[PDB]
């Protein structure tokens, strides 16, 4: 099984909740483990060191004090290998930041509507997915600064999209939100594939035409049958889904009946098969994420009283619970380092907790 120890803790001076944490899984052979935190109008980088040390690297303080960053996601430059950090929040502005300098190199506006989550495509580092308060999902190409596609309408989400994930190859997305529903959006169609090819052939300095985005109004599957409240986290586990609402369970399920293939599912599909549930407590509050290590061998989720749950997914039909006496605030998000040796928890009181695998 797995064991961890609290080697360090710190607190950011703004004292506003920290809504996001991400280790850089794109970092090179030799350089140190770096993680980013988001909360208030701040983006902060941290270097993990020996003897449980958490070294401050640099901060980005947005010019707008009314900005509230809710999410971050790392990528890299496909030509140079250099890491980049995407950040967004309440203002509905995506900012692409260079971690070496904290220079905002690129900024995107889909609308002026709050962005809840950012995800990068697992196969194309340029393809950025944003989920918004305006009930839509947006797919961006950050190499050419183009809006490839808008996912939503009457048949899309009927409320705020709180989370989304790409499958293993980035052939499809599963989004979820306040409308209690989880929706599938296929992005490997002849149409989306050509839209991505075109996004790359666009240059506004060499043409008068605008970039025409795909307007996808109909999901490929939809369900309101897994949770009976706001679904605030979703993640693919192969062809299966892990999702949670505020009902003290992470649910493992799949579209259709037990033996149905996800690629054979038609949009009209009325069934869902639940495969299991990860039960816990004191996580009845909205907006609490779960996280997985690189290998998807581990599942971590923080609760509203500062307790951190960890599960081994390699078990037959097990849990472990991480507590410290000075950790009482709600853990909004957790992040495992690429080598699964460090687990970082960020809280509502702007505190950062370091758990090392022993
Ligand atoms: C940390 O967990 C989550 C889960 C879902 C969404 C978000 C962004 C929120 C911030 C609070 C108001 N709604 C948007 C955070």
Swiss-Prot record:
Methylated. Binding to histone H1 'Lys-26' promotes mono-, di-, and trimethylation of internal lysines. GO terms for molecular function: chromatin binding; enzyme activator activity; identical protein binding; methylated histone binding; transcription corepressor binding. GO terms for cellular component: chromatin silencing complex; cytosol; ESC/E(Z) complex; nucleoplasm; nucleus; pronucleus; sex chromatin. Induction: Expression is induced by E2F1, E2F2 and E2F3. Expressed in brain, colon, heart, kidney, liver, lung, muscle, ovary, peripheral blood leukocytes, pancreas, placenta, prostate, spleen, small intestine, testis, thymus and uterus. Appears to be overexpressed in breast and colon cancer. Keywords: Acetylation, Chromatin regulator, Chromosome, Disease variant, Host-virus interaction, Methylation, Nucleus, Phosphoprotein, Repeat, Repressor, Transcription, Transcription regulation, WD repeat. Changing residue 224 to S: In COGIS; decreased trimethylation of 'Lys-27' of histone H3. Residues 71-225, 223-358 are annotated as: Required for interaction with the matrix protein MA of HIV-1. It is linked to Cohen-Gibson syndrome: An autosomal dominant overgrowth disorder characterized by accelerated osseous maturation, advanced bone age, skeletal abnormalities including flaring of the metaphyses of the long bones, large hands with long fingers and camptodactyly, scoliosis, cervical spine anomalies, dysmorphic facial features, and variable intellectual disability. Component of the PRC2/EED-EZH2 complex, which includes EED, EZH2, SUZ12, RBBP4 and RBBP7 and possibly AEBP2. The minimum components required for methyltransferase activity of the PRC2/EED-EZH2 complex are EED, EZH2 and SUZ12. Component of the PRC2/EED-EZH1 complex, which includes EED, EZH1, SUZ12, RBBP4 and AEBP2. The PRC2 complex may also interact with DNMT1, DNMT3A, DNMT3B and PHF1 via the EZH2 subunit and with SIRT1 via the SUZ12 subunit. Interacts with HDAC, HDAC2, histone H1 and YY1. May interact with ITGA4, ITGAE and ITGB7. Interacts with CDYL. Interacts with BMAL1. This is Polycomb protein EED. It comes from Homo sapiens. The chain holds residues 79 to 440 of 441 of the full protein.
């Amino acid at each position: 099984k797995y064991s961890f120890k609290c080697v360090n803790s710190l607190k950011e001076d703004h004292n506003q909740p920290l809504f996001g944490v991400q280790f850089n899984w794109h970092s090179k052979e030799g350089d140190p483990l770096v993680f980013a935190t988001v909360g208030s109008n701040r983006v902060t980088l941290y270097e993990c060191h020996s003897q449980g040390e958490i070294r401050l690297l640099q901060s980005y303080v947005d010019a707008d004090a009314d900005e509230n960053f809710y999410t971050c996601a790392w990528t890299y430059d496909s030509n140079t290998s250099h890491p980049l950090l995407a950040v967004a929040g309440s203002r509905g502005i995506i900012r692409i930041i260079n971690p070496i300098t904290m220079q905002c190199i690129k900024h995107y506006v889909g609308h002026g509507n709050a962005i809840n989550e950012l995800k990068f495509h697992p196969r194309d580092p340029n393809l950025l997915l944003s989920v918004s308060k305006d009930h839509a999902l947006r797919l961006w190409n950050i190499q050419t600064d183009t809006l490839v596609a808008i996912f939503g309408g009457v048949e899309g989400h009927r409320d705020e999209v709180l989370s989304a994930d790409y499958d293993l190859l980035g052939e499809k997305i599963m989004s979820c939100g306040m409308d209690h529903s989880l929706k599938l959006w296929r992005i490997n169609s002849k149409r989306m594939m050509n839209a991505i090819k075109e996004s790359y052939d666009y240059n506004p300095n060499k043409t008068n035409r605008p970039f025409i985005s795909q307007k996808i109004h109909f999901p490929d599957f939809s369900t309101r049958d897994i949770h009976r409240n706001y679904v605030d986290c979703v993640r693919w586990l192969g062809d299966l889904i892990l999702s949670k609402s505020c009902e003290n369970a992470i649910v493992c399920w799949k579209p259709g009946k037990m033996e149905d293939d996800i690629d054979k599912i038609k949009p009209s599909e009325s069934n869902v098969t639940i495969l299991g549930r990860f039960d816990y407590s004191q996580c009845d509050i909205w907006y609490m994420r779960f996280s997985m290590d690189f290998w998807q061998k581990m599942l971590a989720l923080g609760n509203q009283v500062g307790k951190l749950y960890v599960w081994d997914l390699e078990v037959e039909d097990k849990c472990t619970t991480l507590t410290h006496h000075k950790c009482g605030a709600a853990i909004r998000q957790t992040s495992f380092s690429r080598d699964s040796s460090i687990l970082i928890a960020v809280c509502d009181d702007a505190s950062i907790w370091r758990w090392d695998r022993l």
